[PDB]
Structures are given as C-alpha cells and as structure tokens.
Amino acid sequence: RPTFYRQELNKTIWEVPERYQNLSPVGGSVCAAFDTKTGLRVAVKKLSRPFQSIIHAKRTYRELRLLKHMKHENVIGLLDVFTPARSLEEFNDVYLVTHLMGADLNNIVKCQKLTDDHVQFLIYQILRGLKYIHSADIIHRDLKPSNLAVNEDCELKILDYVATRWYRAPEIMLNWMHYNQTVDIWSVGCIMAELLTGRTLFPGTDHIDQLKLILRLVGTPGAELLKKISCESARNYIQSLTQMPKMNFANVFIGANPLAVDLLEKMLVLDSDKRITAAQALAHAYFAQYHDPDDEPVADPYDQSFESRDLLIDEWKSLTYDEVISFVPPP
C-alpha cells in the first residue's frame, strides 16, 4: 500500500499517493500533477461526491468501467485509479489519473489555419479511435473539438463555449430513439469541415435554427428516407419543409482537397443508414498517407449489461470499489 499525503486546493481536499507531485488545479475537479514514477505530466480527477445517490453511484461505476476498458492510442485511458480509503466501509472518494494532453482541437482551430496534411492526420486519428470505440458497441454521442485532446506532436486522443448542438447528428436533433454509431461520424464530418475552413459548419442559435442550417447544406429528405420514419410527428415535420436540394459540397469547401470534399460528402449524409462508418472512412483515399489496416485495432467486447440494472447505492459503491482494487496499471 502506498503512502498518501493531504492538501487543500480551492476549498477541496486532495489525498493522493506521493507518486504524484506539484498538484496544480486546471478545471469532478481536475489537477495537473507530476508522475514521479514515469516523469509524465498527468491529470488527476477527483470525482465530485461519487456515492451521494444512486444516480451518482451508477455514474461513478459507469465512468470507471469505461475508462478501464479503453486501451488505444487515440482514446483517453486510465493510467491509475485510487482512493485513500483502506476499506469498503470508509470508501467515499475516487481519483482517476490520465495523460495530461497539452491542448484541444478548439484551441488549435481558434489559433491557426491548418494545412490539409495536418487535417488528414487529425481526422485520421479521430476515426482510428472511433473505430475501436465503435467496435466495443459504444457510441460517443458528444464528439466536438473540446472533447479531442492533442499533444505538441499532434497526437490526438478522444476524451469522455463550443456548443454540443453544432456537432449533433440530425437524427438526434429530431429525437430518434434508435440512432446508431454513425451519429459520431456526423460529428466528425462537422469537425473536419471546421478544421478545413476555420469556421463552425452549423452554428445554430437553437434546435430549430440548427436544423435549418443543416438542411440548407444537405437538402431535405427524399422519399427513400421518409418511408423509414415511424412516427407521425417526425413525418409531419419533414413534410412541412421547403423542398431543398443538396448543395454540391465543392461549392461550399472551395479549394479544399477534392478527396476531403468527397469524404465530407460521405460523412455528412442526412440518412444515417447511408453514412460511412469509421472503418470504411479509414480506408478512404484521403487518408492514404496514414492508413494501415494492420494497425487500426478493434476493442474487446465491452459488457454494458449493468446499464440495465437497478441496484442500491451500496451495491453500485461496492462494485466500484471492486473495480478500483482490481485495477492493473498499463505497462
């Protein structure tokens, strides 16, 4: 068992192993720290009251399991997890340790005009991480520039104002209950567009405007999609709209690499059934410089059956304790 030390930072007490030094607040609450064991700079997240309630406790468990499962170069994983508690009885605090990445894509994009090469590399990496996440039957749902962290070498990792709505797939905006993994592809298309133009592709003021902006680009639904809409409300909306043709994306992204344009056309498809998958996008010619199918790994199957369980706080808490105790660090 390691030796811990205590200290207070902005009206919060941090109790951590001596391994971690120079705790410095950066934003649960998150501190930057020095990992003496590896000379890495790391982010230490102390979870905000993880067992306050059933919903807090299930979330805490959900977060830990997910992070323990993610083992991929383009997805934030867990370097360490600990609690100062010596028993389940006193277990009331959870700390998660991950790589501290320098910046995020929103910082970058707001502060430099990217080259096509650089966009290729960045988008390639997002898709590589998406492939792995999707192969685990996980949907991110919240992809946006601030959820993508980058180091000075531009190595990218997917994490967990830049408004969420601006990256949300139209089927989520319309509230479809059976959306799929390709909602993340829509987000990637919107991120790619912004990297290439320095502009938010669809900066809606509200949900209605967001859809107006979207439909202006991609056109209104055809009959092939309308015959797939199960509910009257959504069909009444679609049939409301001024019949709009799809823009030719070459007239939107003027001077972009036409393979970038082609890829965007394949990402930003209104009908999610016809949207390219992450695996398929990785093999697109746009990423010819980076694509290697022998180094684009899939994940082990991820057991999400706990999502459908209704358990007591103590039960969620104990399960979390177990996940903490059983943690095996990465090499």
Ligand SMILES: *[C@H](CC(C)=O)c1cccc(-c2nc(NCCc3ccccc3)c3ccc(N)cc3n2)c1
């Ligand atoms: C009906 C009620 C349910 C089952 O939730 C329903 C509500 C909302 C959305 C769908 C639905 N949407 C899409 N994509 C919508 C795309 C669109 C078009 C215009 C404006 C915004 C969004 C679907 C795509 C494909 C299939 N198979 C089904 C879809 N259902 C349904």
